[PDB]
Design brief:
It is classed as cytosolic protein. The entry lists the keywords Assembly, Intermediate, Complex, cytosolic protein. This is part of a larger assembly, with chains A, B and C. Chain B is an all-alpha fold. Chain B is 66% helix and 0% strand. Chain B has 8 helices and no strands. The relative contact order of chain B is 0.11. Classes of the chains: A mainly alpha, B mainly alpha, C mainly alpha. At the A-B interface, helix 1, helix 3, helix 5 and helix 6 of A face helix 1, helix 2 and helix 4 of B.
């Protein structure tokens, strides 16, 4: 016996990696070395999942600080935590009284956003993190359009928010 | 093939499944390392991710883009937004199914593509059917309450999964009308 | 070599990507039969006439035919004439000297046409009547269950002794229902 020789849709997890490596080398040849892959493989999954868990906390990741399709997935989950940090930077204060009460009520939601991450996943699928934080991360990028991330403060805010 | 397929189907285009807006997802189809047997099953799988990216783009573009809005129902208004919410909620089994496929890829990475194809054949009917329902409303510049009727005629459909799936969007757009009338009356 | 070596090993590449098949053999007529008959033909003085077919292995055929039978179209084997799959007379297996093969592959091609036309018909409803739509839905509801059993067999290929007469006999209650 030698086996039934499965194709390049069923023989991967090793020929998958070889096929990716060959494709990247082919693209670098077809360009001229002007392309430069930053190695979108190594690190593997769980390390990557911990890193994207860390960017949602508010601390910076391993490629961003203030398979090659991983870049597309990675940008979408990186800019989320980049917005969360820039929202804490806008809520940095101890002036209008209602503006202060508004900012503290915002921080009561930012605490929820920090609580949802790292209470549900310890480490999970790379797709699960994006799907789980799609209905919620959309809310966070709504807050950038809402806030100033001229602009109402104080009494102007008390009328504008009403 | 293992992660690349799920990455394509989730709506992140790679360098194997190259996004165009004229041809959607597409295999490279210029290597003698993949062959006509797997090619066809793959094209059948490419269709779903193409439609999916269209869906998500429209939903994101028009929901959560303004505070809450002069006026054109095909671009503005609460009813279009409530439509996009209903369309997003019917797409939740697609996400759940793709998640299950990753678990089986973890269990054995040498399972056949036809098993995957068999799993995703039920979406293969459903996605093109809802695409025309959204496309007619946006293309004809349909305003106001006529949107509710346009989906209602396509919930008279001759495919039961499509019919129930569109009925859920009709439930959402009825809900916003209930919510307004409950104060107006 | 180094990537083509890995390709040649684990993936096949031998009639459908150009690489002349050097598949080992035990010769000695029961599996050398095509060669035995060709040598007999030459020794009887044909005169000459070298027959050129490119030599596929046995199991590859059976797997490809499964994918043909399930309901997906466009495979490498089986020359199409209008959208009608027919037997390919440009391939050959180590025995049977391409005649018994020409009969039995014609049988499965006869099934392949019936499934080809029905699946094309179903595709052309998605690109109303209220009765055609239910009709294709019933046809489709049969096809998904049929395709599932074919696909699990194809999965179980990789997981033994495989030859024609087992998979043909096993699919008798399916090719009966197909008619």
């Amino acid at each position: 016996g030698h086996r039934e020789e499965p194709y390049l849709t069923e023989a991967g997890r090793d020929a998958f990696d070889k096929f990716c490596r060959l494709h990247q080398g082919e693209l670098q040849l077809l360009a001229g070395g002007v392309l430069q892959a930053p190695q979108p493989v190594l690190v593997k999954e769980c390390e990557l999942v911990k890193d994207v868990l860390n960017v949602l906390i508010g601390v910076v990741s391993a490629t961003f600080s203030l398979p090659e399709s991983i870049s597309s997935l990675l940008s979408e989950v990186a800019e989320y935590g980049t917005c969360y940090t820039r929202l804490s930077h806008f809520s940095l204060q101890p002036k209008g009284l209602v503006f202060q009460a508004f900012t503290s009520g915002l921080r009561r939601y930012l605490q929820y956003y920090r609580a949802c991450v790292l209470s549900t996943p310890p480490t999970l699928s790379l797709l699960t993190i994006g799907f789980l934080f799609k209905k919620l991360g959309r809310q966070l990028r709504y807050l950038a359009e809402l806030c100033g991330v001229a602009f109402p403060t104080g009494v102007k805010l008390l009328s504008y928010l009403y | 093939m293992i992660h690349e397929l799920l990455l394509a189907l989730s709506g992140y285009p790679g360098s194997i499944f190259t996004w165009n807006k004229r041809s959607g997802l597409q295999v490279s189809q210029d290597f003698p390392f993949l062959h006509p047997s797997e090619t066809s099953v793959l094209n059948r799988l490419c269709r779903l991710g193409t439609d999916y990216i269209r869906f998500t783009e429209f939903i994101e573009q028009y929901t959560g883009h303004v505070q809450q809005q002069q006026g054109q129902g095909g671009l503005h208004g609460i009813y279009l937004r409530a439509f996009c919410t209903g369309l997003d909620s019917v797409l939740q089994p697609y996400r759940q199914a793709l998640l299950d496929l990753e678990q089986e890829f973890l269990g054995d990475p040498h399972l056949s593509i036809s098993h995957v194809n068999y799993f995703l054949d039920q979406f293969q009917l459903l996605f093109p059917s809802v695409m025309v329902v959204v496309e007619q409303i946006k293309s004809q510049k349909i305003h106001g309450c006529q949107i509710l009727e346009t989906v209602y005629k396509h919930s008279c459909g001759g495919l039961p999964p499509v019919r129930s799936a569109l009925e859920k969007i009709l439930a959402v757009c009825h809900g916003v009308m209930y919510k307004q009338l409950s104060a107006w009356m | 070599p180094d990537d083509r070596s890995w390709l040649e090993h684990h993936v096949v590449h031998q009639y459908w990507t150009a690489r002349p098949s050097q598949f080992p053999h035990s010769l000695h007529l029961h599996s050398n039969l095509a060669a035995v008959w060709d040598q007999h033909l030459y020794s009887s003085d044909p005169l000459y006439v070298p027959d050129d077919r490119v030599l596929v292995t046995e199991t590859q055929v059976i797997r490809e035919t499964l994918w043909l039978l399930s309901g997906v179209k466009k495979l490498f084997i089986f020359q199409l004439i209008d959208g009608k799959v027919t037997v390919r007379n440009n391939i050959i297996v180590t025995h049977l000297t391409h005649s018994c093969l020409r009969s039995v592959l014609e049988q499965i091609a006869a099934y392949g046409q019936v499934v080809f036309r029905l699946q094309e018909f179903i595709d052309e409803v998605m690109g109303p009547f209220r009765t055609y739509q239910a009709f294709m839905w019933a046809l489709y509801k049969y096809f998904i269950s049929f395709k599932e059993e074919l696909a699990e067999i194809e999965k179980c290929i990789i997981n033994t002794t495989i030859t024609l007469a087992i998979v043909v006999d096993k699919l008798a209650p399916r090719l009966s229902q197909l008619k």
